[PDB]
Design an enzyme around this catalytic site. Sequence first.
Site, PDB file in Angstrom:
ATOM      1  CG  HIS A  76      97.765  -7.680  67.500  1.00 25.50           C
ATOM      2  ND1 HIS A  76      97.069  -8.415  68.432  1.00 25.50           N
ATOM      3  CD2 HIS A  76      98.386  -6.694  68.189  1.00 25.50           C
ATOM      4  CE1 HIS A  76      97.291  -7.921  69.638  1.00 25.50           C
ATOM      5  NE2 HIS A  76      98.098  -6.881  69.519  1.00 25.50           N
ATOM      6  CG  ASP A 100      95.560 -11.317  67.360  1.00 27.54           C
ATOM      7  OD1 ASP A 100      96.500 -11.286  66.548  1.00 27.54           O
ATOM      8  OD2 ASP A 100      95.381 -10.411  68.223  1.00 27.54           O
ATOM      9  N   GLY A 156     101.472  -3.108  74.935  1.00 24.90           N
ATOM     10  CA  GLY A 156     102.709  -3.858  74.870  1.00 24.90           C
ATOM     11  C   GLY A 156     102.700  -5.159  75.640  1.00 24.90           C
ATOM     12  CB  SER A 158      99.042  -8.223  72.964  1.00 26.81           C
ATOM     13  OG  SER A 158     100.088  -7.907  72.044  1.00 26.81           O
TER      14      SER A 158
HETATM   15  C1  LIG Z   1      88.477  -6.586  70.213  1.00 29.29           C
HETATM   16  C2  LIG Z   1      87.879  -5.341  70.917  1.00 29.29           C
HETATM   17  C3  LIG Z   1      86.873  -5.779  72.017  1.00 29.29           C
HETATM   18  C4  LIG Z   1      87.152  -4.449  69.873  1.00 29.29           C
HETATM   19  O1  LIG Z   1      88.879  -4.588  71.601  1.00 29.29           O
HETATM   20  C5  LIG Z   1      89.892  -3.979  70.857  1.00 29.29           C
HETATM   21  O2  LIG Z   1      90.065  -4.220  69.708  1.00 29.29           O
HETATM   22  N1  LIG Z   1      90.712  -3.033  71.605  1.00 29.29           N
HETATM   23  C6  LIG Z   1      91.969  -2.577  71.094  1.00 29.29           C
HETATM   24  C7  LIG Z   1      92.432  -1.412  71.947  1.00 29.29           C
HETATM   25  C8  LIG Z   1      93.798  -0.855  71.429  1.00 29.29           C
HETATM   26  C9  LIG Z   1      94.313   0.215  72.421  1.00 29.29           C
HETATM   27  C10 LIG Z   1      95.501  -0.362  73.216  1.00 29.29           C
HETATM   28  C11 LIG Z   1      95.015  -1.477  74.169  1.00 29.29           C
HETATM   29  C12 LIG Z   1      96.234  -1.901  74.998  1.00 29.29           C
HETATM   30  C13 LIG Z   1      96.748  -3.144  75.027  1.00 29.29           C
HETATM   31  C14 LIG Z   1      96.178  -4.388  74.309  1.00 29.29           C
HETATM   32  C15 LIG Z   1      96.503  -5.859  74.454  1.00 29.29           C
HETATM   33  C16 LIG Z   1      96.872  -5.135  73.167  1.00 29.29           C
HETATM   34  C17 LIG Z   1      98.369  -4.830  73.072  1.00 29.29           C
HETATM   35  O3  LIG Z   1      99.098  -4.557  73.978  1.00 29.29           O
HETATM   36  N2  LIG Z   1      98.901  -4.905  71.764  1.00 29.29           N
HETATM   37  S1  LIG Z   1     100.510  -4.573  71.570  1.00 29.29           S
HETATM   38  O4  LIG Z   1     100.779  -3.185  71.954  1.00 29.29           O
HETATM   39  O5  LIG Z   1     101.365  -5.457  72.365  1.00 29.29           O
HETATM   40  C18 LIG Z   1     100.863  -4.765  69.810  1.00 29.29           C
HETATM   41  C19 LIG Z   1     102.354  -4.850  69.524  1.00 29.29           C
HETATM   42  C20 LIG Z   1     101.470  -6.099  69.445  1.00 29.29           C
HETATM   43  N3  LIG Z   1      96.145  -5.474  71.964  1.00 29.29           N
HETATM   44  C21 LIG Z   1      95.740  -4.500  70.997  1.00 29.29           C
HETATM   45  O6  LIG Z   1      96.159  -3.388  71.062  1.00 29.29           O
HETATM   46  C22 LIG Z   1      94.775  -5.001  69.933  1.00 29.29           C
HETATM   47  C23 LIG Z   1      95.318  -4.937  68.402  1.00 29.29           C
HETATM   48  C24 LIG Z   1      94.189  -4.671  67.707  1.00 29.29           C
HETATM   49  O7  LIG Z   1      93.291  -5.809  67.732  1.00 29.29           O
HETATM   50  C25 LIG Z   1      93.660  -6.817  66.768  1.00 29.29           C
HETATM   51  O8  LIG Z   1      94.387  -6.648  65.831  1.00 29.29           O
HETATM   52  N4  LIG Z   1      93.052  -8.107  67.013  1.00 29.29           N
HETATM   53  C26 LIG Z   1      92.680  -9.210  65.925  1.00 29.29           C
HETATM   54  C27 LIG Z   1      91.805 -10.109  66.589  1.00 29.29           C
HETATM   55  C28 LIG Z   1      91.299 -11.504  66.185  1.00 29.29           C
HETATM   56  C29 LIG Z   1      90.359 -12.250  67.118  1.00 29.29           C
HETATM   57  C30 LIG Z   1      89.905 -11.644  68.443  1.00 29.29           C
HETATM   58  C31 LIG Z   1      90.393 -10.247  68.848  1.00 29.29           C
HETATM   59  F1  LIG Z   1      89.992  -9.662  70.038  1.00 29.29           F
HETATM   60  C32 LIG Z   1      91.355  -9.523  67.877  1.00 29.29           C
HETATM   61  C33 LIG Z   1      92.028  -8.128  67.986  1.00 29.29           C
HETATM   62  C34 LIG Z   1      93.441  -3.567  68.541  1.00 29.29           C
HETATM   63  N5  LIG Z   1      93.743  -4.093  69.999  1.00 29.29           N
HETATM   64  C35 LIG Z   1      93.056  -3.657  71.219  1.00 29.29           C
HETATM   65  O9  LIG Z   1      93.362  -4.105  72.286  1.00 29.29           O
END
Ligand SMILES: CC(C)(C)OC(=O)N[C@H]1CCCCC/C=C\[C@@H]2C[C@@]2(C(=O)NS(=O)(=O)C2CC2)NC(=O)[C@@H]2C[C@@H](OC(=O)n3cc4cccc(F)c4c3)CN2C1=O
Length: 198
Positions: A76, A100, A156, A158
């Site tokens: 992602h 992912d 940021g 992930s």
């Molecule tokens: C799954 C569940 C329980 C419903 O929770 C959540 O969906 N919650 C959200 C909360 C978002 C709020 C910010 C949270 C803060 C930091 C988070 C770590 C982070 C990040 O830093 N990204 S980034 O800024 O670096 C970015 C620049 C790279 N990831 C995200 O945002 C991801 C992205 C998106 O999810 C996905 O596309 N995938 C595809 C998958 C395939 C398999 C398994 C998975 F789980 C998958 C999840 C939503 N995401 C969450 O976390």
Amino acid sequence: HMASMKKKGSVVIVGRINLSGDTAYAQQTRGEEGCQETSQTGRDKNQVEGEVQIVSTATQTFLATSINGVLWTVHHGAGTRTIASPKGPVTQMYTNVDKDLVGWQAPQGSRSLTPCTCGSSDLYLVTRHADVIPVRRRGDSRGSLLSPRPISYLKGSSGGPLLCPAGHAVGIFRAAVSTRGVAKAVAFIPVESLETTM
Ligand SMILES: CC(C)(C)OC(=O)N[C@H]1CCCCC/C=C\[C@@H]2C[C@@]2(C(=O)NS(=O)(=O)C2CC2)NC(=O)[C@@H]2C[C@@H](OC(=O)n3cc4cccc(F)c4c3)CN2C1=O
Ligand SMILES: [Zn+2]
């Protein structure tokens, strides 16, 4: 039309999380203008060090972690993008949208983490600000923060690692489990899933 079609840029290493000493800290190795240019060319001559890289595209910044000679990150963040390297863009060697997960051959100069075989549930998450957050493992792909944090704190990061007490890689940070904007738990890609991919 066909002649004007653009191409997406490369992922660019812009810094690293320094874990070598007794103090963890984020280091920037390239600024925004240089990151933009390197994304377009795919040619990055900067020296790479360490296990956790800070990476960017034109639109996002996140982390990437070397484990067993592969630099891993989240799909992602990276999509199907190449990574910039001294000899030009490098194609992903692993791509798995279902997990992912993506990976490229680890850059020369990086150091790799070893997959954990401890079977231990006391973990540590490393953020892009070089915070080291204790996390109790709660399942195959989930762990709870011992002290909850607003999601702003985790955004940021992930692609960063969850580690065991001995510094082995246990997983790659994927998603934050938040209620009303507070993260009480994290979801990660278990290292065994990477090991199977390899
Ligand atoms: C799954 C569940 C329980 C419903 O929770 C959540 O969906 N919650 C959200 C909360 C978002 C709020 C910010 C949270 C803060 C930091 C988070 C770590 C982070 C990040 O830093 N990204 S980034 O800024 O670096 C970015 C620049 C790279 N990831 C995200 O945002 C991801 C992205 C998106 O999810 C996905 O596309 N995938 C595809 C998958 C395939 C398999 C398994 C998975 F789980 C998958 C999840 C939503 N995401 C969450 O976390
Ligand atoms: Zn271990």
